[PDB]
């Protein structure tokens, strides 16, 4: 409903996160590979470049307000 999270923000966050994850290898070998390939396809899906992260997100405190109306937390 009140989700103020922009798709471009999330998309850039996904590729940004994945890249930093493979950077320190904070996941299984094929896991990292899967994240990389998914990242590539996701970038294509949103028609943006994985390297555009700093352009979309930057450091303006990207608060991806997306609750998806989930009140079933517990």
């Amino acid at each position: 409903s009140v989700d103020s999270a922009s798709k471009e923000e999330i998309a850039a966050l996904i590729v940004n996160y994945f890249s930093s994850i493979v950077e320190k290898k904070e996941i299984s070998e094929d896991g990292a590979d899967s994240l990389n390939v998914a990242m590539d396809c996701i970038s294509e899906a949103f028609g943006f470049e994985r390297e555009a992260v700093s352009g979309i997100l930057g450091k303006s405190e990207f608060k991806g307000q997306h609750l998806a109306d989930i009140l079933n937390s517990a």
Binding site: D30, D33, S34, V37, D40, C41, E44, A45
Partner: protein, 81 residues
């Protein structure tokens, strides 16, 4: 014969339907893509099955082709400029 629908998202994209053997290797699929001028090298290809990842020398009886899907996502990186 097992029904496998090859769905390539990235360019060049395509969606071909083919029948493979239960003991068939993913390598055969990769080679077929290259032979059809749709892929550059097997090394740059990875098949996706509803999240489930496939390997080059993997067999259909190993990864288990889910009947509720039968859709294989093709991921290829073009080496040709």
């Amino acid at each position: 014969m097992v029904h496998l629908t090859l769905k390539k998202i990235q360019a060049p994209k395509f969606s071909i339907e083919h029948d493979f053997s239960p003991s068939d290797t993913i390598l055969q699929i990769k080679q077929h893509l290259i032979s059809e001028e749709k892929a550059s090298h097997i090394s740059e290809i990875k098949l996706l099955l509803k999240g489930k990842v496939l390997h080059d020398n993997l067999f259909l009886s190993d990864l288990k082709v889910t009947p509720a899907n039968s859709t294989i996502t093709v991921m290829i990186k073009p080496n040709l400029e």
